[PDB]
A paper describes a structure:
Integration of a DNA copy of the viral genome is an essential step in the replication of all retroviruses. The target of the INSTIs is the IN active site engaged with viral DNA (vDNA) ends in the context of the nucleoprotein complex termed the intasome. As in most transposases, the catalytic site is defined by the Asp-Asp-Glu catalytic triad (D65, D122 and E158 in [name] and [name] INs), which coordinates two catalytically essential Mg2+ ions. The [name]-1 intasome:INSTI structures showed, as we previously reported, a twofold symmetric IN dimer of dimers with the two [name]γ molecules that laterally flank the intasome.
[name] represents a class of INSTIs built on a naphthyridine-based backbone. It is one of a chemical library of candidate INSTIs designed to fill the binding pocket to a larger extent and occupy the substrate envelope. [name] binds to the active site of the [name] intasome in a fashion similar to BIC. However, due to the presence of the 3-(dimethylamino)-3-oxopropyl substituent at position 6, it reaches much further along the active site. The 6-substituent positions itself equidistantly between the β4-α2 linker and Y149, coming in close contact (<4 Å) with the backbone and side-chain atoms of both regions. Y149 is shifted significantly closer to the drug, compared with its position in the RAL- and BIC-bound intasome structures. The three compounds are 4-amino-substituted naphthyridines featuring all of which have an additional extended substitution at 6-position with a 3-(dimethylamino)-3-oxopropyl, phenylsulfonylethyl or hydroxyethylaminooxopropyl group, respectively. Overall, compounds [name], XZ446 and XZ448 exhibited the best characteristics, displaying IC50 values of 120.2 ± 36.1 nM, 115.4 ± 9.5 nM and 131.9 ± 29.7 nM, respectively, compared with 410 ± 78.5 nM of RAL. In line with our in vitro data, [name] and XZ446 were most potent in inhibiting [name]-1 infection of Jurkat T cells, exhibiting ~2.5- to fivefold improvements in EC50 (1.67 ± 1.52 nM and 2.57 ± 0.81 nM, respectively) compared with RAL (6.42 ± 4.24 nM). Based on our structural data, it is likely that if IN resistance mutations would occur in RAL-treated patients; these mutants would also be less efficiently inhibited by [name].
Numbering used by the authors:
A (entry chain B), C (entry chain E): 3 to 280
B (entry chain A), D (entry chain D): 3 to 39, 52 to 148, 157 to 280
E (entry chain C), F (entry chain F): 27 to 112, 124 to 333
The structure:
Amino acid sequence: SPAKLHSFTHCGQAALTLHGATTTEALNILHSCHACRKNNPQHQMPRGHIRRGLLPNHIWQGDITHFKYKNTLYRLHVWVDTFSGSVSATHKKRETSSEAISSLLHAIAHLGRPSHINTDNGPAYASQEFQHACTSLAIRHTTHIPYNPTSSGLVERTNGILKTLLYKYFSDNPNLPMDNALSVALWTINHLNVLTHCQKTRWQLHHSPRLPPIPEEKPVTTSKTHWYYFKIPGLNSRQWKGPQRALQEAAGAALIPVSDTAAQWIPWKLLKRAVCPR
Amino acid sequence: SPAKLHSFTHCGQAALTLHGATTTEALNILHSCHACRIRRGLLPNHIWQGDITHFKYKNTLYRLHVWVDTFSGSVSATHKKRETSSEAISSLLHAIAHLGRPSHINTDNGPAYASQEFQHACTSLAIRHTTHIPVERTNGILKTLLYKYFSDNPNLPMDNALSVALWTINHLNVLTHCQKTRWQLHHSPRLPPIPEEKPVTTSKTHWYYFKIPGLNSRQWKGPQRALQEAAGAALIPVSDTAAQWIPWKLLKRAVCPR
Amino acid sequence: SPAKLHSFTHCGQAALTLHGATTTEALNILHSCHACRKNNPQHQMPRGHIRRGLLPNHIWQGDITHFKYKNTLYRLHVWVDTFSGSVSATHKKRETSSEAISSLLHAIAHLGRPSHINTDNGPAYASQEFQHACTSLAIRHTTHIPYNPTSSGLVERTNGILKTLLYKYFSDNPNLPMDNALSVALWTINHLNVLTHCQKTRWQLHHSPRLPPIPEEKPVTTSKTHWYYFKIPGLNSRQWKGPQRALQEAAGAALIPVSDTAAQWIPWKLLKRAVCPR
Amino acid sequence: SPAKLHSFTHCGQAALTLHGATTTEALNILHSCHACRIRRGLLPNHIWQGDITHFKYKNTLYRLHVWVDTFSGSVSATHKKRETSSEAISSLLHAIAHLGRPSHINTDNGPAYASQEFQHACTSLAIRHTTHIPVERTNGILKTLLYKYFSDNPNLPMDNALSVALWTINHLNVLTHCQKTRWQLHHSPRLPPIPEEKPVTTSKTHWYYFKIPGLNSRQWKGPQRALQEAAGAALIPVSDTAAQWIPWKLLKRAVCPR
Amino acid sequence: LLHIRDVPPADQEKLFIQKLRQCCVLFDFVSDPLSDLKWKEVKRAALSEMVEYITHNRNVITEPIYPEVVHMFAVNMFRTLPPSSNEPTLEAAWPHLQLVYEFFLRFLESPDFQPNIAKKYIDQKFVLQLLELFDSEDPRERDFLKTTLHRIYGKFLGLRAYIRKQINNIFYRFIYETEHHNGIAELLEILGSIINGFALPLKEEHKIFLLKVLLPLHKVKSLSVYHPQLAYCVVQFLEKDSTLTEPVVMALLKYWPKTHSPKEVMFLNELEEILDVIEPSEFVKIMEPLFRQLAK
Amino acid sequence: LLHIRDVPPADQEKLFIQKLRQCCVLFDFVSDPLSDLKWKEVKRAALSEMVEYITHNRNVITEPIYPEVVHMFAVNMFRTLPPSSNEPTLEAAWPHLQLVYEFFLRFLESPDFQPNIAKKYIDQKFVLQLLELFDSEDPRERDFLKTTLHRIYGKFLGLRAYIRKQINNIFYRFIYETEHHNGIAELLEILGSIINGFALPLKEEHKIFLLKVLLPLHKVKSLSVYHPQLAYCVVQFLEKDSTLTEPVVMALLKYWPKTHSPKEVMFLNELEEILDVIEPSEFVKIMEPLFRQLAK
DNA sequence: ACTGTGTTTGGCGCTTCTCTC
DNA sequence: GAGAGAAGCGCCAAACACA
DNA sequence: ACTGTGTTTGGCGCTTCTCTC
DNA sequence: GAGAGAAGCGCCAAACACA
Ligand SMILES: CN(C)C(=O)CCc1cnc2c(c1)c(N)c(C(=O)NCc1ccc(F)cc1F)c(=O)n2O
Ligand SMILES: CN(C)C(=O)CCc1cnc2c(c1)c(N)c(C(=O)NCc1ccc(F)cc1F)c(=O)n2O
Ligand SMILES: [Mg+2]
Ligand SMILES: [Mg+2]
Ligand SMILES: [Mg+2]
Ligand SMILES: [Zn+2]
Ligand SMILES: [Zn+2]
Ligand SMILES: [Zn+2]
Ligand SMILES: [Zn+2]
C-alpha cells in the first residue's frame, strides 16, 4: 500500500507511483502529510510590495544608517519619497527622537510636508516625542512588522546608494569634509543621476505638474480566510509551525494566532499553505 | 487646521487662503495674533546673491550664510559659529544641493569669498564669480520669522527654527506680484522650444506586459498603454473601469501591436 | 566638460550624456574610473561548476556535517558519487583522520573503489594519515580553494537532503534509534527516491551497464591572461582590490598575486574585469 | 599494482586476473604469499538467510549479524557486542540499506527473531518470516579473511577490517561457476519482458537547448539530442567532432523539430 | 444626475456630452456673494469628476466631443473684461475658472487629440478671442493663459504666421495707441519659447519684427515690471546670428536716454549680457561709439 | 591507418568500412600462444576505437554498413565449436571476442538502427548459427550470447514463431537425442523474459509448449545446475491462468520420483511457490492426490 | 589543477471524461 | 443527442539551505 | 493597516558607415 | 562601383547589498 510505505519511509511521488498509485492519489498523500510539509523549507506564495504614494509628498519612508569616516561613526537620517524617489539626508553624531524630529523638519524644508510616513520599529521612532511631533504637523505615522526590514526596502536601498557615492568621494580625496561630501552626493542623486526605468530625474518627478489627479481607490478585500503554517519573523526557525487559521487577511500579510492569547501580523513570505482539516 | 498652521509657522493670510481658510477668517486669524498685529537674473539659477549675517541672541551669536536667487527669491540659509572660506564652501555646496547649480555668483568682499580656496571651489564647479562693494530684505524676513519663533518658545535648538523658517518662506508664503510661492517660481519647468516648419508631435509612451500584484501569476496578460510613469511603479489600466499602479518588477517592455 | 564633471561628482552615464557627450565617450569614462569600479559590488563573469565523473566510481565528494539528537552531537561523514549521485553516510561521535579513513573504507565497501576524491580543507582531510590511506589504495585526493564551500556544493546539498529525512523520521517517533534512522534514510535516498531531472534512481545509475565508454577529453586551455579586481575568499571585503594580472587562468578560477611574494587561486565569482592599463 | 592489491586485500588469483595480472603471474603471486599457500532463491532479494556468529579474539568476543542472499551470495555483516531483538532489527535495516528490501526472510530460532519486536519490524516492511531448526560457508570465508587481515596487522579497530573483508568478498572475488563477482550478480538488471504481437520499439530520448559552460552566454544555441543522461549533467554533442557533459542548469527542455 | 464612470460604455459618450452641456449654465459671483449655492457646488463637483475622468481613460474623445468642448470653454471664458481699476484684485469666480482651465489644459494635451479635427472647429476667431483675454488682472489667470497659448501655438501649423502678425499688431497698439496692458511678461515668455526654435538662415520677416517692435519696447515707462523677460528674448536673437547684432546695438545706443534716471541700470544690466556674447567674432565695429555713449 | 574521428565526414563512411574490413582477418590464440603480436594489438585497438566511436555520434550508420557488420560478426564468431571436454576452461581468444561482443551489443541497440534494413541482411540462417553457439563452455560467452539473443528476439517481428519452434526442437533434442548441453540456464532466462509478456487468452500452442518440453525437463540428471531459473519459468505460466494449472500439478505428482534422492528437496522447494499461488480460486480438486503423493 | 547544487511547490496548458438541455 | 464543466497529468521558474 | 528595491554590467540585435576587390 | 567589416546605440537578466 502506498499510504503505509510513505508513512514508513516518506518517499516521494514517483516512488509511490511505481509501487502502484495514480498521480492524484500520490500527490494527495504528499500534500496530506504533516511531516513532509513541516520539514520542507520550500513554499510558494505571492510577493509583497511596499505602499507607494499617488503623488509627491504623499507617503515617505525614513531610516537611520551608520557611516564610518576618519574614526567617526556618523548617523545618517534618510527620508525618501515613495513617488518621486527624492532623497533628503542629514548627518548627526548619535540617534535620538529629537534628532529624528530635526531630520524630519529639515526634510520637510527641503522637499515639502508629507501626509503619511512609515518607518521601522526603531527606538527613536516609537517614542512619544516623535508621535507628538508628527501629530503637531498632522502627519500620520505607522510602523512596519518588527524584524522585517524588507518592508522598508526602498529606503534601505537608498541607504546603500548614498553610501556608495560617499565611498567614491572618499576614494579620490580622503581629506574631504563630511558635510561637503553629503551635499555633493545629494546634489548628484537628486539632480544629476537619472532613474533607470522612467528615464527621468528624481527632481523632475518631484516638481512635475500635478495636473494628473488621484485615481480613486477601493478598500475592498477578500472575505475568506485560510490555514497556514508560519514562521515568526523575529527568530529564524528550521521547521514550520501550526497550522493555524488566519483571523483576517490583508494585502501582503495575515493575522495569525501564535499563541492562545494574542495574534501577530505575519508577512506572506514566512507563511506556507495548509490543507483544510475538515 | 488654519489656526494650528499659523500658530506653528506664523505665515501670512494669503498663505492661509490657499488652505481651507477664506479671506475673511484669514484676516481674522491674522489680526488675532499678538506677535503678528528689481530682478537682475533672467532665469532661476542664473545669478545668486550671497551674504553673511550676524544673528543676535541673549547670550550667543550665530553666523548665517544666506544665498538668495535674484529671479525667484528662493533662500538657502545655513548657520555656523565661525566664518571662514571652508564654511563659505560648505554653505555654497549646501545651497547647490537644495536649489541647484548656479551659473553666475555674486557676493561682497571679505575674509571669505576672496581666498584661493573659494576661487578654486568656484572653478571646480565652473561658476563665474564677481565681487563688488556697496539682497538685504529677505535677510530681514528671515530674522523676524526666527525672532517670532523664538518668542513663541524659548526652548529651540536653532536648527529646527531655521528649518521651519525656510519651509515657511519657500513653501508657505506667496509672492504678491504673481500669487505664487518661491518654490513654485523656482522649480516651475519652462516652456519647451517650438521648432519652425516642423509640427510639435505629442510624445507616445510605451507598452507593457503586466502582472497583477498579489496573485502569484506566471503569464503576462495583455499589453497595455501606460498613463503615468513614476519611480517604482507605472499606471496601467487593469480593466476598462479602473487603473492601478503596477511595480516595475511586474512590468515587461513590449512593442506596439501595429 | 564631462570628464571633470564626473571626476568631481562621479555621476552616471545619462548625466554625462545630458551635459554633452556621446554614449561611447560617457561609457568609456565610466569604465575607466577606478573609483567607480572599486566601489561598485556589481560584476558580470561566468559561473563555475564542480568537476563530474564520466562513469560511476570516477570522482567522489566527501564532507562532514553535524546532527543534534537527544542531547547528542553526531558527526555524519558523507560521500557522494558525482556521476550517479549515490550516497554513503556513517555516524560517529567526533571527527578525526582515522574516522575519515573508516568512513572512506565503509563507503568503498558499499559502493566501490573510486579513482579520485575531492574534499574541502578540513582538519581531518589534509592530515598525513589521510594522504597515506589514499595512497595505500591508489586514490588521488585533491583539495578545494579554502573558505569556498560552493566548490563542494553537491555534497553540501546532499547533507541537507539527508538531514531533512532524519527530521521527518524523528517527527513521527522521537524514540527511534540513530542507526535505524540512518539506514532507513539511506535506503530511501538510494533505492526509493527518484532523481528530478533524469527521472531515475541513484542505484539504477550506479549499476547501469558501463557499455558507454569514456569520451576523450582535451586539456587545452586559453593561452591569454587578463587584469582583474579581486576579493579574498577567506575574509569578506566591501571594496575590490587591485587590479592585478593573472599568472594563469583555469576553468572556473584564476591565479592572482595577492602580494609581491606569492599568488593565490581565486574563483571566478570573487573577480571583476579590469581595463588594460596600457 | 597486483602485488599491493593482494597484500592489502588477499583476494584470489582469478580476482587478480581481472586486473593487469595474467594467469601465470597471478598464480605466482598467489603461491608467493605465506598466509595464502544449491540456490534456493529464484531472484536477487527473494530469500535471505540470517545468522549470528561469534568472532573469537585473544581477549574479547564479537557478535557478527550476517545476512546472505540465497541467489547471489551477497553478504551484509554488522558487528556488535551484545545480542538482542533491537540489534537484529538494526542489522536487518543495515542489510536492507546495503542490498535492498527482501521479500522473504529465513532464520533460526533464538532470543532474537522470535520476540514481538522482530515480528512487528518484519510486518512494518511487509516481509514474510519463516523460522526453522537444523549458509554456514560464507561465514567461514568471512572468518578466514578477517583472520588473515588481523594476522597481517594486529593493530586494527575491527570496523576497517570488516569493511575491507566485505569489499573483498562482494567486489573483488569472482564466482567459479559464472566468472562474476557477487556484486555484479546481485545488481545485474534483468531482461525486460517481451510483449506478444507488439514490437518493442527503441525508446527515444529528449531534445535540449544548451549553453556552453564558462562563456556567460544568454542565448540557447541549437536543440540537440542527448546521448547519455546522468545525475547533474547530460551528454550533448557541442560539435560534430566532440561531445561534452553539460550541467542541468544550462539545459532547457525542447520539442522535436518535426 | 449619474456619474460617468458608473455607466456602460455604449451610452457613456452621451452622458459625457450631457455633463458637458449641464455646465454651460453661467454663475456670477460678482453679481452677489450668495446665489445658487447648490447649483455652484454641483457644477464644481462635475468639473472635478470630468477632469479626473478625462485623464485616466483612452479612446474616450471622438468627433462629437471636440466642438462642444470648445463651445463650453467659449461660454465659460469669453466675456466682457472687468472694468479697468489700475496687490491686484482677485476674480471672485476663481473656483470654476481654475477647474475649467485645468480641464482645458488636460484636454488639449491628451494623446488621443487629433490635429485634423480642430482645424474646422477652432478658427482664427477663437484664438483672437483668447488672445484678447490676456489683459486680465489676476496673475493666475495670465499664467494659465500663457501655458494654454503655448500649447495652442505648438500644436497647430496653419495658425503660426497669423499669430505672429497679430502679436505684431498688438505690440504696435500697446506702444502707440493704447498704453493700458498687463499681460506683457507672459507674451514675452511665449515669444522667447517661439524664437528659441528658429532655423538658419533667419528670414527677413523676423528681422523686421526685431527692428520694429522689440527694441522700441524699451521706451515704455512701465518697463521694470517686465524687465528681465524682455532681455531674455533679445539674448535669443543675437545667439542665432552674430552678424545682425549691429542694428540692435545701434538702436540701444542711439535711443539710450541722455537723462539720469534710476532705471538706467536696467539697460546696463542688459548690456552686460550682450557684451558677454559680443566679444568673439571680432566685434569692434561699434566698440568706440558704445564707449563714447557709455562715458556720458 | 588513419583514425576515423580525424577525417572529413565526406569520406568518413569509407574509412569506417575499411576499418571494419581490416578486422575481418582471423587470429588464432589456440594455435600457438604467440603469433602476430602487433597485428593482434592493432586489431584490439581498432575494435576499441570502433566501439568508442559508434556510441558517440548519430546518423553515422546507413545502408552500406548493415550487411558488412553482420559479415564481420559471422567471420569473428561463427566457427566450429571447441572439442568437448566436459572450473570451466576459458577461451584464449577472449580479448577480441569480448571487444567484438561489446561492439555488436552497442550496434544492435543504437537509436539509428532501422528494423526495415536487417530483414534482408539477417535471415533464419544467421539466427540458427547464433543459437548453435550457446553450447560454449565459457560462462561469459553464454552471458553475452543471452543478452544478444534477448535483443534479437525483441527487435524483430517475423522471427518469433520460428525461434519458438526452434527452441522446442532443441529442447526435444536435448531431452531425447543428445544429452550434452550447458546453455540451458541462459535459454531458460530468455524463455522467462519472453513469457512474462504474454496476453490473454493464451493460445493452445503455448499450452503444448508447457505440456511437452518444460515439465519433462525435470527428469534431467543435471537439473540442479539450472534448478532455480526453471522454477521461475513455471511460476510465470500459472500466474497468467490459474485454470490451466491442473495438468502441471498432475505431471509433477505422477512423475515425481518414488525413490529417495538428495535432489528431491528441489521439487519440494518448487511445490512451495506453487502452493503459495494455488490456495486462492478454491483449488482443492487435486489437493487430496497431492497430499497422498507427498505422504510417501 | 582551480570551479554550486538538488528538491519542493502551486499555477497552467493539456487531454480526457461526465452530467445536463 | 451533444458541447459544456470537471478530473487527470506532465511540466516549470522561483525559493530554499547546505556551519 | 499589514507588504523588497534600484543600480550595475557585458553580451546582442540592431542600424549606419568605411575601406577594399 | 558595391557588398563586406566596423562603429554606434538601445536594451536586458542576473548579482548585489541595504545592520
Ligand atoms: C580552511 N580552514 C582552515 C578550515 O578550518 C575550514 C573549515 C570548514 C570545513 N568545511 C566546511 C566549512 C568550513 C564551511 N564553512 C561550510 C559551509 O559554510 N557550508 C554552508 C554553505 C554556504 C554556501 C554554500 F553555497 C554552500 C554551503 F554548504 C562547509 O559546507 N564545509 O564543508
Ligand atoms: C524591533 N526592535 C525592538 C528593534 O530594535 C529594531 C532594530 C532595527 C531597526 N532598523 C533596522 C534594523 C533593526 C535592521 N536589522 C535592518 C537590516 O537588517 N537591514 C539589512 C537588510 C536585510 C534584508 C533586506 F531585504 C533589506 C535590508 F535592508 C534595517 O534596515 N533597519 O532599518
Ligand atoms: Mg534599514
Ligand atoms: Mg566541510
Ligand atoms: Mg560542507
Ligand atoms: Zn510524508
Ligand atoms: Zn501669528
Ligand atoms: Zn567615477
Ligand atoms: Zn596473500
